[PDB]
Amino acid sequence: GFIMEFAENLVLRLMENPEERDRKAREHIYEMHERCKKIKEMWALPIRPYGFWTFERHNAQLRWDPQISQVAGRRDPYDDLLEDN
Amino acid sequence: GRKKGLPEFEESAPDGFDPENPYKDPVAMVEMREHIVREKWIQIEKAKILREKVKWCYRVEGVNHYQKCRHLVQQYLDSTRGVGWGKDHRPIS
Protein backbone atom coordinates (compact mmCIF):
# COMPACT_ATOMS: atom_id res chain seq x y z
CA GLY A 1 0.00 0.00 0.00
CA PHE A 2 1.04 3.57 0.80
CA ILE A 3 2.62 5.08 3.91
CA MET A 4 -0.32 6.59 5.78
CA GLU A 5 -2.64 3.57 5.56
CA PHE A 6 -0.02 1.65 7.55
CA ALA A 7 1.22 4.42 9.85
CA GLU A 8 -2.37 5.01 10.98
CA ASN A 9 -3.04 1.55 12.38
CA LEU A 10 0.59 1.38 13.53
CA VAL A 11 -0.02 4.37 15.80
CA LEU A 12 -3.37 2.87 16.82
CA ARG A 13 -1.61 -0.33 17.93
CA LEU A 14 1.01 1.78 19.71
CA MET A 15 -1.67 3.55 21.75
CA GLU A 16 -3.18 1.72 24.72
CA ASN A 17 -6.61 0.87 26.08
CA PRO A 18 -8.05 3.90 27.92
CA GLU A 19 -10.68 1.79 29.70
CA GLU A 20 -7.85 -0.27 31.19
CA ARG A 21 -6.07 2.96 32.13
CA ASP A 22 -9.14 4.39 33.88
CA ARG A 23 -9.83 1.13 35.71
CA LYS A 24 -6.20 0.90 36.84
CA ALA A 25 -6.25 4.54 37.97
CA ARG A 26 -9.38 4.17 40.11
CA GLU A 27 -8.06 0.86 41.48
CA HIS A 28 -4.62 2.26 42.34
CA ILE A 29 -6.32 5.17 44.09
CA TYR A 30 -8.52 2.78 46.11
CA GLU A 31 -5.74 0.51 47.37
CA MET A 32 -3.34 3.43 47.86
CA HIS A 33 -5.84 5.17 50.13
CA GLU A 34 -6.59 1.95 52.02
CA ARG A 35 -2.86 1.36 52.54
CA CYS A 36 -2.48 5.00 53.60
CA LYS A 37 -5.09 4.45 56.31
CA LYS A 38 -3.30 1.24 57.34
CA ILE A 39 0.05 3.03 57.71
CA LYS A 40 -1.63 5.86 59.62
CA GLU A 41 -3.00 3.27 62.04
CA MET A 42 0.41 1.58 62.30
CA TRP A 43 2.19 4.82 63.22
CA ALA A 44 -0.23 5.19 66.16
CA LEU A 45 1.18 2.17 68.03
CA PRO A 46 3.01 3.20 71.22
CA ILE A 47 6.62 2.17 71.72
CA ARG A 48 5.69 0.21 74.85
CA PRO A 49 2.89 -2.32 74.26
CA TYR A 50 0.03 -2.50 76.74
CA GLY A 51 0.93 -6.00 77.91
CA PHE A 52 4.76 -5.80 77.97
CA TRP A 53 5.58 -7.67 81.22
CA THR A 54 2.56 -9.93 80.61
CA PHE A 55 4.45 -11.39 77.65
CA GLU A 56 5.99 -14.78 78.39
CA ARG A 57 9.42 -13.69 77.14
CA HIS A 58 9.39 -10.77 79.62
CA ASN A 59 9.02 -12.85 82.79
CA ALA A 60 11.90 -15.35 82.57
CA GLN A 61 11.80 -15.83 86.35
CA LEU A 62 8.35 -17.10 87.37
CA ARG A 63 9.22 -20.47 85.78
CA TRP A 64 12.94 -20.46 86.69
CA ASP A 65 12.89 -19.70 90.42
CA PRO A 66 10.46 -22.53 91.41
CA GLN A 67 13.03 -25.10 90.24
CA ILE A 68 15.77 -23.19 92.10
CA SER A 69 14.04 -22.58 95.47
CA GLN A 70 15.25 -26.03 96.54
CA VAL A 71 19.00 -25.43 96.19
CA ALA A 72 21.17 -24.44 99.14
CA GLY A 73 21.39 -20.70 99.66
CA ARG A 74 17.76 -19.91 98.80
CA ARG A 75 15.65 -22.02 101.19
CA ASP A 76 13.28 -20.65 103.79
CA PRO A 77 14.84 -21.47 107.21
CA TYR A 78 11.78 -23.61 107.99
CA ASP A 79 12.46 -26.07 105.17
CA ASP A 80 15.47 -28.10 106.31
CA LEU A 81 14.13 -28.47 109.86
CA LEU A 82 11.01 -30.52 109.05
CA GLU A 83 12.30 -32.15 105.84
CA ASP A 84 13.90 -35.00 107.82
CA ASN A 85 10.48 -36.61 108.36
CA GLY B 1 -5.94 -1.60 21.59
CA ARG B 2 -7.92 1.44 20.45
CA LYS B 3 -11.42 2.24 19.22
CA LYS B 4 -9.79 4.15 16.32
CA GLY B 5 -12.50 6.80 16.58
CA LEU B 6 -13.93 9.50 18.78
CA PRO B 7 -13.13 8.88 22.47
CA GLU B 8 -16.56 7.85 23.75
CA PHE B 9 -17.11 8.90 27.37
CA GLU B 10 -19.89 8.18 29.84
CA GLU B 11 -22.47 10.97 29.78
CA SER B 12 -23.95 9.73 33.06
CA ALA B 13 -22.85 11.68 36.12
CA PRO B 14 -20.78 9.48 38.46
CA ASP B 15 -22.55 8.02 41.47
CA GLY B 16 -21.55 8.12 45.12
CA PHE B 17 -20.76 11.85 45.11
CA ASP B 18 -22.07 14.20 47.79
CA PRO B 19 -21.60 17.99 47.53
CA GLU B 20 -21.62 18.37 51.32
CA ASN B 21 -18.66 15.98 51.80
CA PRO B 22 -16.81 15.70 48.48
CA TYR B 23 -13.48 14.80 50.10
CA LYS B 24 -14.99 11.82 51.93
CA ASP B 25 -14.92 9.65 48.79
CA PRO B 26 -11.60 9.94 46.91
CA VAL B 27 -12.23 7.24 44.31
CA ALA B 28 -15.25 9.17 42.98
CA MET B 29 -13.48 12.55 42.93
CA VAL B 30 -11.50 12.26 39.70
CA GLU B 31 -14.36 11.12 37.47
CA MET B 32 -16.62 13.87 38.82
CA ARG B 33 -13.86 16.37 38.04
CA GLU B 34 -13.53 14.93 34.53
CA HIS B 35 -17.30 15.10 34.01
CA ILE B 36 -17.43 18.72 35.19
CA VAL B 37 -14.59 19.74 32.86
CA ARG B 38 -16.20 17.87 29.96
CA GLU B 39 -19.51 19.66 30.53
CA LYS B 40 -17.69 23.00 30.73
CA TRP B 41 -16.04 22.24 27.38
CA ILE B 42 -19.47 21.35 25.97
CA GLN B 43 -20.67 24.82 26.97
CA ILE B 44 -17.51 26.33 25.46
CA GLU B 45 -18.14 24.59 22.15
CA LYS B 46 -21.79 25.65 22.18
CA ALA B 47 -20.62 29.25 22.58
CA LYS B 48 -18.14 28.72 19.74
CA ILE B 49 -20.91 27.33 17.53
CA LEU B 50 -23.06 30.39 18.23
CA ARG B 51 -20.05 32.58 17.44
CA GLU B 52 -19.63 30.74 14.12
CA LYS B 53 -23.32 31.23 13.34
CA VAL B 54 -23.10 34.98 13.92
CA LYS B 55 -19.80 34.93 11.98
CA TRP B 56 -21.67 33.62 8.95
CA CYS B 57 -24.58 35.97 9.68
CA TYR B 58 -22.59 39.19 9.48
CA ARG B 59 -21.43 38.50 5.92
CA VAL B 60 -24.90 37.77 4.52
CA GLU B 61 -26.63 40.33 6.76
CA GLY B 62 -25.28 43.33 4.85
CA VAL B 63 -25.89 46.89 6.02
CA ASN B 64 -28.98 46.11 8.12
CA HIS B 65 -27.52 43.31 10.21
CA TYR B 66 -29.54 44.26 13.31
CA GLN B 67 -32.91 43.46 11.75
CA LYS B 68 -32.87 39.71 11.10
CA CYS B 69 -30.13 38.37 13.41
CA ARG B 70 -30.99 40.15 16.67
CA HIS B 71 -32.52 36.96 18.07
CA LEU B 72 -29.27 35.02 17.63
CA VAL B 73 -27.26 37.78 19.32
CA GLN B 74 -29.00 37.21 22.65
CA GLN B 75 -28.52 33.46 22.23
CA TYR B 76 -24.78 33.95 21.73
CA LEU B 77 -24.42 36.39 24.63
CA ASP B 78 -26.27 34.21 27.16
CA SER B 79 -23.85 31.40 26.30
CA THR B 80 -20.95 33.81 26.83
CA ARG B 81 -22.36 34.70 30.25
CA GLY B 82 -21.63 31.26 31.71
CA VAL B 83 -18.33 30.58 29.95
CA GLY B 84 -15.88 28.12 31.45
CA TRP B 85 -13.01 29.73 33.35
CA GLY B 86 -13.23 33.37 32.32
CA LYS B 87 -13.93 36.77 33.86
CA ASP B 88 -15.33 37.52 37.33
CA HIS B 89 -18.70 36.00 36.35
CA ARG B 90 -18.18 32.41 37.52
CA PRO B 91 -21.08 30.11 36.57
CA ILE B 92 -22.70 27.95 39.24
CA SER B 93 -23.18 24.57 37.58
DSSP states of B54-87 as a string?
Answer: HHHHHHHH-S-HHHHHHHHHHHHHHHHHT-TT-S
- Is the Cβ–Cβ distance between B58 and B47 less than 8 Å? no
Distance from CA of B19 to the nearest CA of A (A): 20
Q: How far apart are CA B82 and CA B29, in angstroms?
A: 23
Distance from CA of A46 to the nearest CA of B (A): 28
> 3-class SS at B32?
helix
Asked if B70 is an interface residue toward chain A (Cβ–Cβ < 8 A), one would say no
Among B44, B56, B53, B36, smallest CA distance to B80 is for: B44
The method of structure determination was cryo-EM
Q: How far apart are CA A18 and CA B63, in angstroms?
A: 51
